[PDB]
Write a protein that binds this DNA or RNA. Structure first.
Ligand SMILES: [Cl-]
Ligand SMILES: [Cl-]
Ligand SMILES: [Cl-]
Ligand SMILES: [Cl-]
Ligand SMILES: [Cl-]
Ligand SMILES: [Cl-]
Ligand SMILES: [Cl-]
Ligand SMILES: [Mg+2]
Ligand SMILES: [Mg+2]
Ligand SMILES: [Mg+2]
Ligand SMILES: [Mg+2]
Ligand SMILES: [Mg+2]
Ligand SMILES: [Mg+2]
Ligand SMILES: [Mg+2]
Ligand SMILES: [Mg+2]
Ligand SMILES: [Mg+2]
Ligand SMILES: [Mg+2]
Ligand SMILES: [Mg+2]
Ligand SMILES: [Mg+2]
Ligand SMILES: [Mg+2]
Ligand SMILES: [Mg+2]
Ligand SMILES: [Mg+2]
Ligand code: NA
Ligand code: NA
Ligand code: NA
Ligand code: NA
Ligand code: NA
Ligand code: NA
Ligand code: NA
Ligand code: NA
Ligand code: NA
Ligand code: NA
Ligand code: NA
Ligand code: NA
Ligand code: NA
Ligand code: NA
Ligand code: NA
Ligand code: NA
Lengths: 49, 150, 142, 142
RNA sequence: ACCCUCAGAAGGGAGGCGAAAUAGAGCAUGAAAUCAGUUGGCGAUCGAGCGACAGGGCAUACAAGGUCCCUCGACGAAUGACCGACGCGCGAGCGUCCAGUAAGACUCACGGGAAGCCGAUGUUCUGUCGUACGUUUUGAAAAACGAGCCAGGGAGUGUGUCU
RNA sequence: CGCUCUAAUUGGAUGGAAGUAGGGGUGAAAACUCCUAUGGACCGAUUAGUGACGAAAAUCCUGGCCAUAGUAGCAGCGAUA
RNA sequence: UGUCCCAACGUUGGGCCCGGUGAACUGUACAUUCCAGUGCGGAGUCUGGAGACACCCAGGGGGAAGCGAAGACCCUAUGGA
């Protein structure tokens, strides 16, 4: 859940802002956002044997 | 904060500085540029006239909207930064003071180097229409002065 | 006043453009030239049309401007500028080291460049720069 | 009283006539800078070469004036590739034992920057006695 | 610490500690954007993808590059004459011979020279070419779309099955 | 070509590592390297591995910063002080 | 009856200069342009010419298909309500 712990949402078009999910006016969740999730992260599930 | 950007021979040099002064960094530029090369004593006289409004400071870089002044020479726009000029009297008052305490003839010392540097802003916020707020800051100026024997 | 022309050319009864062409070619080779008797230079053609062109040039213009000479003086010089890259350094140099005069202020008599002369005996359809200027409204100061 | 670099600073390698000619060719011809397109229009774009990918790229399209595109054809002569401008073939050296096997005629040595002054001194003296040149030598006041 | 200055527990100067205060309090290092002062180049008659490649001016401590300039001579691919002799053409001019000669890029040797001198770097001038970049598109400099600038962040990963 | 950490082999560093600034040399190039200064403790090479491994862009995210500009506002209200 | 012919003068607060305070919109880059032409057919940047010494103050806004809003109209989606 790292980076997914929030209800952030995108205002969409209309304020000259990029469609990025935001909360309290701070972008969140998405990979390109500081504090966002890690696109493709290390995984426990992977077989390293 | 700044450090002297120039080398100064201690046997023939007097130093001084102002720290985090909340004044016009833009006027400082002008004032510094203006008084450079002058004599600490001629410098004080000048600034005191500027404060009196009988002498104007050439505003050569930061001049948008500035009205012309017949007394400026070789240029056209100029004003009378009294606040910034008073801060400069304190600087000079300090340097002529350190000058004397060292045995030199303060007033009669040339202004070898004098430079203002914007060291930051005291941040402020101004409410605006539509429930929005915006910057409303103050610049903090540092200024180095190096007197030198003629 | 005083112009050390390595070459002085007489334009009288000479085809303006053919003179201008050579005068350019020389000035670009570093030659200081002076054109004499501009008012007596000639350009072939049906006078009426010829004047319509030049007259159109005087009338052209706007705030930015289109300054076109009326004196046979400038006429010739502007004709020559058109043959030089006058906005480059080289060209402006070559154009500046050239000068056109009304009549002849020198003592020497100008030379006549080869192939620029017009035989008035076998020619009737042509015009004098001066004639052109009088029509444009210039002040016959010659 | 003056600085003097240690070792055989003046040493030159001995090359066959072909290598020497091929070396002079590389030095004469040279090569384009090969800097990343438009690296000079934006500070965030550094000089490091990157292949223009723009479908409309003026460089990628080979429009004269927009820079050379890295190609094999630009390589330097097999026989001289990698040689110092002097003619020597460099050898990276980290200690005294690295000096073993080095032909002081064909090769010169370059002491890695990490190596300290103490170890440098030893490397520099034994290199000289082996007839090898130190490309980056120490300047001592003599 | 002490002393001078100052309205002053502010600040500044001098001074002290320490290997270092450019380690002096949000105090290791201290990039880019960017700001002050200043140095080099350009500069108040001149034109705009900001450059690439050539070639000139001016500027440059060492170091890590050491070349480069002129006489002559050797070698000399393709290309390749002038003049003069003779013969043609109304003529511009051509043919034969002189001659595949003289010449001919690079490279080299002897002699002489340069150390801001050669390279290189900074800036500027000249020539040639040149209306960003990425994307949308049949067609983009585009009056199509994106970015004020910089730094850091920012997009083929895991399990199972199949081939 | 370059990055992280692992392993084997093998090196450098307070007689000054990394990083940073400016500068010299190599490579067609990704990049490698050296010099000077700053810095003051870590840093590599080869081979085999490893992967939240390479940015100029997404009205991209966060921070910082410049022009805008010493510019607009600090007048307008039946309460003009 | 200043709505108009048809505009005038005056009053007060701004505007303009000075001290102090001090934002924001906007910004790919370059930029002194004009007339034509050309080009994805609506160009400050291409091409040809013309004009153009540099800086600054005020103005009214002709142009930047000016700024502001991923077009509400129209069509398309095996979209939504
Ligand atoms: Cl400011
Ligand atoms: Cl006009
Ligand atoms: Cl021109
Ligand atoms: Cl006739
Ligand atoms: Cl290859
Ligand atoms: Cl050769
Ligand atoms: Cl992939
Ligand atoms: Mg996170
Ligand atoms: Mg004004
Ligand atoms: Mg509110
Ligand atoms: Mg750049
Ligand atoms: Mg620090
Ligand atoms: Mg279309
Ligand atoms: Mg990054
Ligand atoms: Mg090994
Ligand atoms: Mg890309
Ligand atoms: Mg304004
Ligand atoms: Mg009242
Ligand atoms: Mg033009
Ligand atoms: Mg839409
Ligand atoms: Mg509808
Ligand atoms: Mg429905
Ligand atoms: Na939360
Ligand atoms: Na697992
Ligand atoms: Na200005
Ligand atoms: Na005056
Ligand atoms: Na004046
Ligand atoms: Na004619
Ligand atoms: Na006209
Ligand atoms: Na140069
Ligand atoms: Na697109
Ligand atoms: Na494009
Ligand atoms: Na267009
Ligand atoms: Na902004
Ligand atoms: Na990635
Ligand atoms: Na935005
Ligand atoms: Na009225
Ligand atoms: Na307008």
């Amino acid at each position: 859940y790292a980076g997914l712990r929030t209800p952030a949402e995108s205002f969409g078009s209309g304020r000259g802002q990029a469609h990025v999910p935001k909360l309290d006016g701070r972008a969140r969740r998405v990979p390109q956002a500081v504090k966002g999730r890690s696109a493709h992260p290390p995984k426990t599930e992977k077989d390293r044997s | 904060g700044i450090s002297y950007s120039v080398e100064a021979d201690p046997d023939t040099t007097a130093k001084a500085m102002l720290r985090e002064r909340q004044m016009s960094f833009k006027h400082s530029k002008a004032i510094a540029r203006e008084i450079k090369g002058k004599t600490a004593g001629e410098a004080v006289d000048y600034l005191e006239a500027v404060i009196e409004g009988d002498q104007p400071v050439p505003f050569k870089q930061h001049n948008s909207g500035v009205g012309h002044k017949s007394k400026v020479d070789g240029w056209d726009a100029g004003r009378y930064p009294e606040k910034a000029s008073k801060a400069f009297l304190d600087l000079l008052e300090n340097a002529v003071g350190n000058a004397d305490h060292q045995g030199f003839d303060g007033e009669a010392m040339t202004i070898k180097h004098v430079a203002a540097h914007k060291v930051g802003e005291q941040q402020g916020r101004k409410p605006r229409a539509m429930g929005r707020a915006s910057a409303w800051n103050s610049p903090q100026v540092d200024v180095e002065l190096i007197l030198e024997e003629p | 006043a005083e112009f050390d022309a390595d070459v002085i050319v007489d334009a009288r009864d000479c085809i303006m453009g053919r003179v201008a062409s050579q005068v350019a070619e020389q000035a670009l080779d570093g030659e200081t030239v002076a054109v004499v008797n501009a008012e007596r230079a000639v350009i072939t053609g049906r006078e009426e049309q010829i004047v319509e062109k030049y007259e159109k040039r005087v009338d052209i213009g706007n705030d930015n401007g289109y300054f076109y000479p009326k004196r046979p003086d400038g006429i010739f010089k502007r004709t020559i500028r058109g043959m030089l890259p006058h906005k480059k350094q080289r060209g402006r140099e070559a154009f500046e080291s050239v000068r056109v005069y009304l009549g002849n202020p020198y003592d020497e008599d100008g030379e006549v460049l080869d192939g620029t002369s017009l035989d008035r005996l076998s020619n009737i359809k042509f015009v004098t720069l001066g004639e052109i200027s009088e029509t444009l409204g210039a002040n016959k100061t010659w | 009283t003056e600085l003097q670099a240690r070792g055989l600073t003046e040493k030159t390698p001995d090359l066959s006539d072909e290598d020497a000619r091929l070396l002079t060719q590389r030095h004469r011809v040279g090569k384009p800078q090969f800097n990343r397109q438009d690296h000079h229009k934006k500070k965030r774009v550094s000089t490091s070469w990157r292949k223009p990918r723009g479908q409309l790229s003026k460089q990628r399209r080979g429009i004269k004036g927009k820079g050379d595109t890295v190609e094999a054809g630009f390589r330097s002569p097999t026989a001289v590739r990698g040689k110092h401008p002097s003619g020597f073939e460099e050898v990276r050296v980290h200690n005294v034992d690295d000096l073993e096997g080095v032909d002081g005629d064909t090769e010169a040595v370059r002491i890695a920057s990490k190596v300290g002054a103490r170890k440098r001194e030893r490397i520099e003296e034994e290199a000289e006695d082996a007839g090898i040149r130190v490309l980056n030598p120490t300047y001592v006041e003599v």
